Design a protein around this nucleic acid. Structure first.
Ligand SMILES: [Mg+2]
Ligand SMILES: [Mg+2]
Ligand SMILES: [Mg+2]
Ligand SMILES: [Mg+2]
Ligand SMILES: [Mg+2]
Ligand SMILES: [Mg+2]
Ligand SMILES: [Mg+2]
Ligand SMILES: [Mg+2]
Ligand SMILES: [Mg+2]
Ligand SMILES: [Mg+2]
Ligand SMILES: [Mg+2]
Ligand SMILES: [Mg+2]
Ligand SMILES: [Mg+2]
Ligand SMILES: [Mg+2]
Ligand SMILES: [Mg+2]
Ligand SMILES: [Mg+2]
Ligand SMILES: [Mg+2]
Ligand SMILES: [Mg+2]
Ligand SMILES: [Mg+2]
Ligand SMILES: [Mg+2]
Ligand SMILES: [Mg+2]
Ligand SMILES: [Mg+2]
Ligand SMILES: [Mg+2]
Ligand SMILES: [Mg+2]
Ligand SMILES: [Mg+2]
Ligand SMILES: [Mg+2]
Ligand SMILES: [Mg+2]
Ligand SMILES: [Mg+2]
Ligand SMILES: [Mg+2]
Ligand SMILES: [Mg+2]
Ligand SMILES: [Mg+2]
Ligand SMILES: [Mg+2]
Ligand SMILES: [Mg+2]
Ligand SMILES: [Mg+2]
Ligand SMILES: [Mg+2]
Ligand SMILES: [Mg+2]
Ligand SMILES: [Mg+2]
Ligand SMILES: [Mg+2]
Ligand SMILES: [Mg+2]
Ligand SMILES: [Mg+2]
Ligand SMILES: [Mg+2]
Lengths: 51, 48, 121, 129
RNA sequence: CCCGCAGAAGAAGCACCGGCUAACUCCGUGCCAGCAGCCGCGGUAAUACGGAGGGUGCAAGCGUUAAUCGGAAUUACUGGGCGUAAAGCGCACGCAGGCGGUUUGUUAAGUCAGAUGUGAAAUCCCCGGGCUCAACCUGGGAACUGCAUCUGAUACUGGCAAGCUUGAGUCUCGUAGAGGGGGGUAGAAUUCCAGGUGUAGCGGUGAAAUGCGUAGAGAUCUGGAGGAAUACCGGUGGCGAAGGCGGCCCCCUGGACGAAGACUGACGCUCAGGUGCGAAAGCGUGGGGAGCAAACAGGAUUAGAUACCCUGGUAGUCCACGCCGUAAACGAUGUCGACUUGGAGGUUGUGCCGGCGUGGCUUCCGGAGCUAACGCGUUAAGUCGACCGCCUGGGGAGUAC
RNA sequence: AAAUUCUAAU
């Protein structure tokens, strides 16, 4: 429907890992989804790794 | 990320903010500055 | 059933098996913890329940629930377990007695202290 | 097959009462006559009569008081598949004594009060109330 | 045990407050931390989590855990069910076993009544007594529902002897029927083989294509071969224990019913284990093979099509013998017997004068009654009796050993 | 004559 089941990208620059290394783990989102007939609020999660 | 309330909360350092829209447009620096502030504060302590 | 059909073969009562078979008709048992971990409940509940795996003195290997808020248990701690189950956890049917051998009572507790091994201040 | 005459008599009486018949006819015997005599003496039926010489017939005349059955219930107790004998101290009371229970003692067929006044037990034929 | 001294002086906790279940507000957190016997609470305005105030129940105790009975009529002797919620064996015969129409006489085994012996003490229950009361101790009784012996009663059950005819069976005459086993024969049609006429299509589909045809098809006419099934009659019509049985004819053979009379004299009903029959598919041996058609091949449709549709097509379907033993084998309703308002039909016998009756099987509606309701309703799922089979939450599973 | 699907908080 929308975004990605799994997107992996390579970031090149200075001090990239010194700033982005705290983004690993899980991120939770609570909202009214676009794929919802009713107005029900739903909770979902995404998983992020930095290498 | 709570969209109905427009809030973003971080559970590692227990910090909540009401600037979700600025975060989702790419200004997440204010989220990662405090964490490092805590993190580095432990690097000098672990000298024993 | 006809009286003759009952004379030939009487009524048979159900076995009525027990749901705490590791205690063997005892109120409490002593065991050693071999692993301490956290699991997740069934639908619709959501949490991080605190459980442990314990080997008893009669040769059994069971899973116990650690109630309260905050515990000091780690591996190789002798604990005292009792009957009673946790509803939304799959396969947990024993409880850990707080205030027992090597598990301290919940701190800062002020109500229902006797159920958590807390002395009266 | 035909293995119990007494509850056949009882069922005929019951079905006659339920269907508002004026009289019920059946083949006869001696125990049937004794039970009918007890019923007539205790005010449950009007009269009875046996007739014939080779194949006797027993006929009972049923009664209704306020346009309804007098025999509210009549049931068998001691059946061929299970017999019931009671001592003189264990004789039953039907409807706390309002109804009657027919017994057969060594002196003949009678009620439970007549059996207690004779100090006897016997076989419990039926409960009629 | 009693008396004197001083002073309220030495002495209250535990669980619970959403419903079941007696007893509510504020703050903190925000599907986190946590609660929980079952429903279930917590997602930023929680009487359900943690704390505080208040309140409720017990009280030198209060809660939790373990174990037993109850509630549970949820193994139903007292005191349950089986058409559709779990539950009637696919059907039948039948040994052991359970049950038994009617009358007379005898017996006293079951049964009933009385008496005697025993049923240890303690325990439970009742009237008293002693510890200041109670717990506790103790006097007398009642009870210990049981067993054995002796004497009596004969209504019911059982034994023995003699009976009786209504249950059950035999005989005389007849009626109807796709009931079963064996053999023969007839007609229509499809297929194949040979020949005559005749010429460009046929077949199939929603539309097409594969396929057959100028080597003469399809159409049409004549003769022959072979196999399988029997149009019309034909009908909620008939026969059979069930599974099932359909052209005509002969031989062998089982049961049902009807009218009058005669005969035996309870010879009866049900049935665990046992035995026998039991659609279709399937298996072995030997035949047979027209039509149809699992598998298989090709042509289509489709995003795909190991399918539905089209063209072919092998086991099988058929016969003889032998296994298999299963079906939504269903009326989802075990067999036997008695009783209880009516109406409209079908089929098959018989008596009296088209009318009047009287038996067997069968279809539809409906009254009381019964049922959770739907519905059943003299062919009961109504009221009773005898015997058998079966059920005890849903998955796992009619599965593993 | 054709024609597949609709997760997870009311
Ligand atoms: Mg209340
Ligand atoms: Mg609580
Ligand atoms: Mg709040
Ligand atoms: Mg019970
Ligand atoms: Mg119980
Ligand atoms: Mg019963
Ligand atoms: Mg029941
Ligand atoms: Mg059923
Ligand atoms: Mg049947
Ligand atoms: Mg017999
Ligand atoms: Mg006998
Ligand atoms: Mg005797
Ligand atoms: Mg006696
Ligand atoms: Mg005693
Ligand atoms: Mg006799
Ligand atoms: Mg015939
Ligand atoms: Mg025939
Ligand atoms: Mg030709
Ligand atoms: Mg028939
Ligand atoms: Mg015959
Ligand atoms: Mg015949
Ligand atoms: Mg004779
Ligand atoms: Mg039989
Ligand atoms: Mg059998
Ligand atoms: Mg076959
Ligand atoms: Mg075959
Ligand atoms: Mg074969
Ligand atoms: Mg063959
Ligand atoms: Mg074909
Ligand atoms: Mg194909
Ligand atoms: Mg079966
Ligand atoms: Mg059938
Ligand atoms: Mg069945
Ligand atoms: Mg009947
Ligand atoms: Mg009807
Ligand atoms: Mg019913
Ligand atoms: Mg019936
Ligand atoms: Mg019936
Ligand atoms: Mg098997
Ligand atoms: Mg899909
Ligand atoms: Mg949905």
């Amino acid at each position: 429907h929308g975004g990605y089941k799994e997107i992996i990208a390579k970031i090149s620059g200075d001090g990239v890992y010194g700033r982005l290394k705290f983004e690993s783990g899980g991120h939770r989102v609570q909202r009214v989804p676009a794929t919802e007939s009713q107005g029900r609020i739903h909770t979902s999660a995404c998983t992020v790794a930095v290498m | 990320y709570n969209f109905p309330q427009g809030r973003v909360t971080d559970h590692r350092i227990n910090l909540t903010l009401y600037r979700l829209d600025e975060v989702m447009e790419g200004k997440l620096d204010m989220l990662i500055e405090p964490i490092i502030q805590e993190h580095q504060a432990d690097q000098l302590a672990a000298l024993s | 059933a006809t009286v003759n059909q009952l004379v030939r073969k009487p009524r048979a009562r159900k076995v009525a098996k027990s749901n705490v078979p590791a205690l063997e008709a005892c109120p409490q048992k002593r065991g050693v913890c071999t692993r301490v971990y956290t699991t997740t409940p069934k639908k619709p509940n959501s949490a991080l329940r605190k459980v442990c795996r314990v080997r008893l003195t009669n040769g059994f290997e069971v899973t116990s629930y650690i109630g309260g808020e905050g515990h000091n248990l780690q591996e190789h701690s002798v604990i005292l377990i009792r009957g009673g189950r946790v509803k939304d956890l799959p396969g947990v049917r024993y409880h850990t007695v707080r205030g027992a051998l090597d598990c301290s009572g919940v701190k800062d507790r002020k109500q229902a202290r006797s159920k958590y091994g807390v002395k009266r201040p | 097959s035909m293995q119990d005459p007494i509850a056949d008599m009882l069922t005929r009486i019951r079905n006659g009462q339920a269907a508002n018949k004026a009289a019920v006819t059946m083949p006869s015997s001696k125990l049937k006559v004794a039970i009918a005599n007890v019923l007539k003496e205790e005010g449950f039926i009007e009269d009875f009569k046996v007739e014939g010489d080779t194949k006797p017939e027993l006929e009972l005349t049923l009664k209704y008081f306020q346009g309804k059955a007098v025999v509210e219930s009549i049931q068998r107790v001691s059946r061929p598949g299970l017999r019931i004998y009671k001592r003189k101290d264990e004789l039953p009371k039907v409807m706390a004594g309002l109804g009657i229970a027919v017994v057969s003692t060594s002196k003949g067929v009678m009620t439970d009060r007549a059996a207690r006044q004779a100090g006897l037990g016997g076989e419990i034929i039926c409960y009629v109330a």
